[PDB]
């Protein structure tokens, strides 16, 4: 068997942080990668018609300071996405250029319902800590209800509820029946609210890195050499004896003091555990699936939008659209021109079965409609990318909680196991299902060892980041009307 | 590596059924089996103290014919459980004896109300394909919704809302807010509706086997010989070459033609794929867990409960009591006299913080309240089971599909993946859930192999069980008034209208 101080199963950017973290504090590492490849959830494809792109995570953004500072270390440097040009919301077959980053409505009533509802995403996150979820104060009545039954409580207009649905299928790729308000509420709450969750400028989607966000996973891969192993899928954890051992698909025995957990929750499952796991999380890891999401990239001769003043960013509301979400990927230059649309949640499942090329036509015609360009019907190429097919992903971008599971079994994420201690983004309290999440759990599993090994203090495990130099936070702001405009019942209670 | 027809993984009920049926048709099976014994979800403890104790799956009743086959031909017999005397409804600190199925009413709007909800439930049910659940007419709209908004539509009445609570935590081991509403209206539909799921006498807890449920899984074992793989986790199907390759977590091989899977789905996650599963099974494994429940059984010097004309049935209502349902498990000879207790999804994982001794003492104190009896204060023995804690089976009694489930991913559960074929209860078109299910997917599997071999035709992979002469089906009859009276909202329509 191989000894070491640590075997980290998973090479995603989180077991890559954790592992980084021990070996630079001068431990023995071993990095156990399922896959031929290190990134997990990010996933750089480089050839000639792309150059690169990245087909899994890409976006970085202000408050994100852990993964810009990691990949400032690694030698990185980020680029703004496109937002010089007007966004679209496309809304009953019409296009509505706008600026700022909420979309826009006239209709005086649907203007309250629409205000009135992201004001309550906030308010409610406001009661919800980023720590402790189940520790809000409404947390069994938000956790026993899905976001469908919130929004059909909350929204009083069509308009405002399918905007807000498409908010849910957007940033949790998930339907609103399938998730838990309490969670839900706890993800937008925990990346700093709906302005910052939604933001390209100064917000989540603000910034791409140069050669893309596979580079993370990949340059701390080049830094531990042979540390790392890859083809070694997990598929047994035993710590009745003296040291852990983990034995891997291909018959390798590892032999270590501690073990961190680098993989999403529920693909746990792959592992045989002995002794058995604490009952807790053996139920747990069947009740955390992730979201269904094909990220799809058509490539252009120009980035034609531009000249319409358009930024390539397109809201697309309704049944019918394949693609809810566009960004501009074109790169720095202007060149490589593309969009990145998102297949959202059911549409994932259910347009899996064309084929890419039927797939490329569908983007290209709605992309046509709604950038009013027959150049959208020309791609010069198309890149794209299933998450749901992923054995070791088991989906995209991160773990929803169904309702009642957050507030049942939400402590036990993080609860080390005798001597596995739990990283993933999905364990992260700022940024988690997020690249950004990755780094915290990562680099905080890493610091719960060092103690457990009496190395540091218990006061060091959880430690700040000093804001990023290169991608400062301007604040989020409110106006008068905002806070105190009534909600649609508020506006007829007074009536 | 060890050659052979079929490899069945999962020696429970439904692996022991397909593996059976394979032999008997001259097939060279093996079965990998997890664990240090075979039965699964279905597990007889033996000692002097109980002389034998189902701890997982137990009941068998009308309708169940498959179960009653197998054992049947295995050489096993049932008894009733014992519904002789008083069952009890137990709301706001108070006991109310009846008899029927179903705990009355008096008050004629909460009668309205009680009588609409089982009727709706059935109603609903009528509307949703055994085998095609997602093609049910409303199936979108209906798996959207949890049953906790379904109950919030349908019950006028905080009685009907806490009875319902109850049925879908008794039925599910989940909560109302945890399960898709097409989901449990597809599986008390598939087990013949409202009465024949709730019923002792005529219903699903009618009778158990005489030396307990674990003897159909052994006595397969029997007639296997040594076909029957124990501590053979498998880890590992490669599908890339002519035979499937099956590997054991102890580095063992096994080679064959087809595969079934006789696992819960969700414990499809154990298992490396090579190649990967595809898209829709991938994600579905990982969207199905099951439920939670501890089986409690206290024994007693007598059935003391039975002196007071209380058969031992209790349906307890509300948050306080650890236990909301019980039947009396007495031996067939009226000794080892015993209550059966289930604590039901979140008191599973709450109470589960507790020690044995201190869960005793619990349900003895709530034994003694609801049965106004101190002789309950006086247990001999105590055994339980929290499923909870399997690994190689999640939960019990069966896994629950969330909302939005069902209508994504319904179609694959027993969709064939190249060479592997899926048995297990939750496969099963009839009594998914139970025993019964168990082995209508385990014949079902089996016989698609026989099928892909050329054995069989296609119009013998489905087969109707002729009905056991021994436990014969009481029909679900309603009457005229339980069929025409009103719904609480249907009276208010009518009163408007006069
Ligand atoms: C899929 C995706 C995700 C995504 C996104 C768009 C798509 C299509 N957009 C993002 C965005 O713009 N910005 C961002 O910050 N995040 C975005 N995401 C999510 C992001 O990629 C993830 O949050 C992040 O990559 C998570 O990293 P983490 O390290 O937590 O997890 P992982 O990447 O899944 O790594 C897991 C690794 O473990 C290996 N594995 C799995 N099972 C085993 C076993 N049994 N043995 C050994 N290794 C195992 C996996 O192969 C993987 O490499
Ligand atoms: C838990 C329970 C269930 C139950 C019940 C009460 C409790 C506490 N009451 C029941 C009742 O009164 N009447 C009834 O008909 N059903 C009742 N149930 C449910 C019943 O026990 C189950 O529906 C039935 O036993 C399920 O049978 P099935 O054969 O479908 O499934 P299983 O019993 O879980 O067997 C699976 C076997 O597979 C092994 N396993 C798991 N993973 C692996 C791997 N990777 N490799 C090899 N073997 C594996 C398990 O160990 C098990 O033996
Ligand atoms: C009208 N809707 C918005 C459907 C419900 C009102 C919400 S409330 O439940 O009535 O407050
Ligand atoms: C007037 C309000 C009565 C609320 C009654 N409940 C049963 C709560 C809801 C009925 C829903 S539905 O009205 O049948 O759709
Ligand atoms: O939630 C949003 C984007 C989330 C996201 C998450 C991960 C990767 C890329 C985008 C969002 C962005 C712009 C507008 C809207 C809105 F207002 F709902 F349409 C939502
Ligand atoms: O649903 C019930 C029982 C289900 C069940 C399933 C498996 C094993 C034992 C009980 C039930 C039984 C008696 C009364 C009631 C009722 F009506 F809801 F209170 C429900």
Redesign the interface.
Known sequence: SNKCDVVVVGGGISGMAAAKLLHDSGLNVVVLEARDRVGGRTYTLRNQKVKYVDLGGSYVGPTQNRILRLAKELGLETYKVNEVERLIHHVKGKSYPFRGPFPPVWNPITYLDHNNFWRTMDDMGREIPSDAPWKAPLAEEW????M??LLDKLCWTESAKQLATLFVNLCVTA?T??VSALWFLWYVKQCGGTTRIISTTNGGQERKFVGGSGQVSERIMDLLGDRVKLER?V??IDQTRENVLVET?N?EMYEAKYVISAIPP??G??I??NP??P??R??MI?????G?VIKCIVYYKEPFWRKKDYCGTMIIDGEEAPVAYTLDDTKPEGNYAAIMGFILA?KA?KL?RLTKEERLKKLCELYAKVLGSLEALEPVHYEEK?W????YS??CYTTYF????LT??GRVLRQPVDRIYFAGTETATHWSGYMEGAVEAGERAAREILHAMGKIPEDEIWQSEPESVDVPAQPITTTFLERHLPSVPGLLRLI
């Open positions: 956790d026993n209800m899905t469908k039954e339907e029946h399938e899928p598929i047994y698909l018959h529920t693909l499952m792959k045989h555990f058995p796991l009952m807790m053996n139920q069947t009740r955390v699936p992730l269904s059911h499942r899996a299933n749901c097919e992923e054995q088991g989906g169904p309702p009642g599971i049942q079994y």
